[PDB]
Paper text:
The nucleosome remodeling and deacetylase (NuRD) complex is a widely conserved transcriptional co-regulator that harbors both nucleosome remodeling and histone deacetylase activities. RbAp46 and RbAp48 (RBBP7/RBBP4) are ∼50-kDa WD-repeat proteins that were first recognized for their ability to bind the tumor suppressor Rb. RbAp48 has the seven-bladed β-propeller fold common to all WD40-repeat proteins but also displays three non-canonical features: an extended loop (the PP loop; Ref. 16) inserted into blade 6, a long additional N-terminal α-helix that contacts blades 6 and 7, and a single turn of C-terminal helix after blade 7. Our structures reveal that the MTA1 peptide binds in an amphipathic α-helical conformation in the groove on RbAp48 formed by these three structural elements.
We, therefore crystallized two further RbAp48-MTA1 complexes, where the N terminus of each MTA1 peptide was defined by the structurally resolved region in our initial complex (residue 670). We extended the C terminus of each MTA peptide (either to residue 695 or 711) to explore the extent of the structured segment and collected diffraction data to 2.15 Å and 2.50 Å resolution, respectively. Two molecules of RbAp48 and two molecules of MTA1 were found in the asymmetric unit of crystals formed from the complexes of RbAp48 and MTA1-(656–686 and 670–711), whereas one molecule of each polypeptide was observed in the asymmetric unit of RbAp48-MTA1-(670–695). Rcryst and Rfree for each of the final refined models were, respectively, 18.2% and 22.5% for RbAp48-MTA1-(656–686), 18.9% and 23.1% for RbAp48-MTA1-(670–695), and 20.6% and 25.9% for RbAp48-MTA1-(670–711). In all cases the data fitted well to a simple 1:1 binding isotherm, and dissociation constants from representative measurements were 2.3 ± 0.3, 0.05 ± 0.007, and 0.24 ± 0.16 μm for MTA1-(656–686), MTA1-(670–695), and MTA1-(670–711), respectively (standard errors from single curve fits are given). Our data show that the extreme C terminus of the protein (Leu-696–Asp-715) is not required for the interaction. The structures provide a rationale for the higher affinity observed for the MTA1-(670–695) and MTA1-(670–711) peptides as compared with MTA1-(656–686). Residues Ile-688 and Leu-690 form a hydrophobic cluster with Leu-672. This cluster, which cannot form in the MTA1-(656–686) peptide, interacts with the aromatic side chain of Phe-30 in RbAp48.
Author numbering:
A (entry chain C): 671 to 690
B (entry chain A): 10 to 411
Write the structure that this text describes.
């Protein structure tokens, strides 16, 4: 879906919304 | 503090919306009562020509005034083939909801009458029908759930198969020896560790006195755990900030084989790595998980830092030697990967934690009491919190798979 950088980032930022 | 309560709920709403990005599986279930304990049973059934498998959990209840129970629950998990269920569209959220968005997948199978809350319940590895429990009284209890009805008597009469004596207070630590059938260790607020051997109980008796009592700690003993290969070795941790390695063959039960100042505060949990016979973890109120080598306990190998409050549980993955998880008072559950230790990071990523922090599970909104890795479905975790919530979840494959 997203880059490795972004998927890792979302994995450690649970309470920040994910956008494209 | 009503504002923090408001913030937590708003942050939960953000996490919920995000789930399709971060998870392959997320189920949230509201138990009648909160459970202090959670352990997957080892068995899995795959009914004929169906798209799911059935897995089972040992749970308990925590009621102040009402009747508590030892509980066995079933959980359906989707096969890789399975079809999407699109019958639950929601115009409000604009989504179909994933597997287990609605009721149907989780069920209570068995409820056994239990005197007081179930502080911890653990099955005997050599006979998963046998389950030991820690109560708010001193007596550690053993139940063979086949020797009980699935639906309890409404009198609430607790009738355990065995009643194990030795302690003066309640505790949490509970560990069956995986190499010596029937050998159970227990930790307590009385500063002691008890050991029972129930493999040779006479005549179908109902009470058993402790074979040995280990009295090394000078404070509340929080957890105890057998080594997974060496039948005479076991570890313990306590509010005296110490990690202790014990040998059952030793003649002095007031002194451990080894003692380590592991943390700057209470040490609440430990866990031996199931692949690497010398490695073990400990969690603590100092907000860290420490890593140890049994062959040199003077040197802490590593400290996993990030947790925002005390840690009470730590468990290794049953499938990946480098992977472990921790939980505690803060609502977040962290998953670590020791292979990624020391990998250089940009400042933006370093804000979120160290590189060995793989995943932060933000699905809970209250202290996590316990969790368990699913032994048959890799990466599936069951976690339970104080507000009645039980979650069965699995992070998205691309998080750990490149
Ligand atoms: Ca290995």
């Amino acid at each position: 879906l997203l880059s490795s950088s972004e998927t890792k980032r979302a994995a450690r930022r649970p309470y920040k919304p994910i956008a494209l | 503090d009503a504002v923090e309560e408001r913030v937590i709920n708003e942050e939960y709403k953000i996490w919920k919306k995000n789930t399709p990005f971060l998870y392959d599986l997320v189920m949230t279930h509201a138990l009648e009562w909160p459970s202090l304990t959670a352990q997957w049973l080892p068995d899995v059934t795959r009914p004929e020509g169906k798209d799911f498998s059935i897995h089972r959990l040992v749970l308990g209840t925590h009621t102040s005034d009402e009747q508590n129970h030892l509980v066995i629950a079933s959980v359906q998990l989707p096969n890789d083939d399975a079809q999407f269920d699109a019958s639950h569209y929601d115009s409000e959220k604009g989504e179909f909801g994933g597997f287990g968005s609605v009721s149907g997948k989780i069920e209570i199978e068995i409820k056994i009458n239990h005197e007081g809350e179930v502080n911890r319940a653990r099955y005997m590895p050599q006979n998963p029908c046998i389950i030991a429990t820690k109560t708010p009284s001193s007596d550690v209890l053993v139940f063979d759930y086949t020797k009980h009805p699935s639906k309890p008597d409404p009198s609430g009469e607790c009738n355990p198969d065995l009643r194990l004596r030795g302690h003066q207070k309640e505790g949490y630590g509970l560990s069956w020896n995986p190499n010596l059938s029937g050998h159970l260790l227990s930790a307590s607020d009385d500063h002691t560790i008890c050991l029972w051997d129930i493999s040779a109980v006479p005549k179908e008796g109902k009470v058993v006195d402790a074979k040995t009592i280990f009295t090394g700690h000078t404070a509340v003993v929080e957890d105890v755990s057998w080594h997974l290969l060496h039948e005479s070795l076991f570890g313990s941790v306590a509010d005296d900030q110490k990690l202790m390695i014990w040998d059952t063959r030793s003649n002095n039960t007031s002194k451990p084989s080894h003692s380590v100042d592991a943390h700057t505060a209470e040490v609440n949990c430990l866990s031996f790595n199931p692949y690497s016979e010398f490695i073990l973890a400990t969690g603590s109120a100092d907000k860290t998980v420490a890593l140890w080598d049994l062959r040199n306990l003077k040197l802490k190998l590593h400290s996993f830092e990030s947790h925002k409050d005390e840690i009470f549980q730590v468990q290794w993955s049953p499938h990946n030697e480098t992977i472990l998880a921790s939980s505690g008072t803060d609502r977040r559950l962290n998953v670590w990967d020791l292979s990624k230790i020391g990998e250089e990071q940009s400042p933006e990523d370093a804000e979120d934690g160290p590189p060995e922090l793989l995943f932060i599970h933000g699905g809970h909104t209250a202290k996590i009491s316990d969790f368990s890795w699913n032994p048959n479905e890799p990466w599936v975790i069951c976690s339970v919190s104080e507000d009645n919530i039980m979650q069965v979840w699995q992070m998205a494959e691309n998080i750990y798979n490149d």
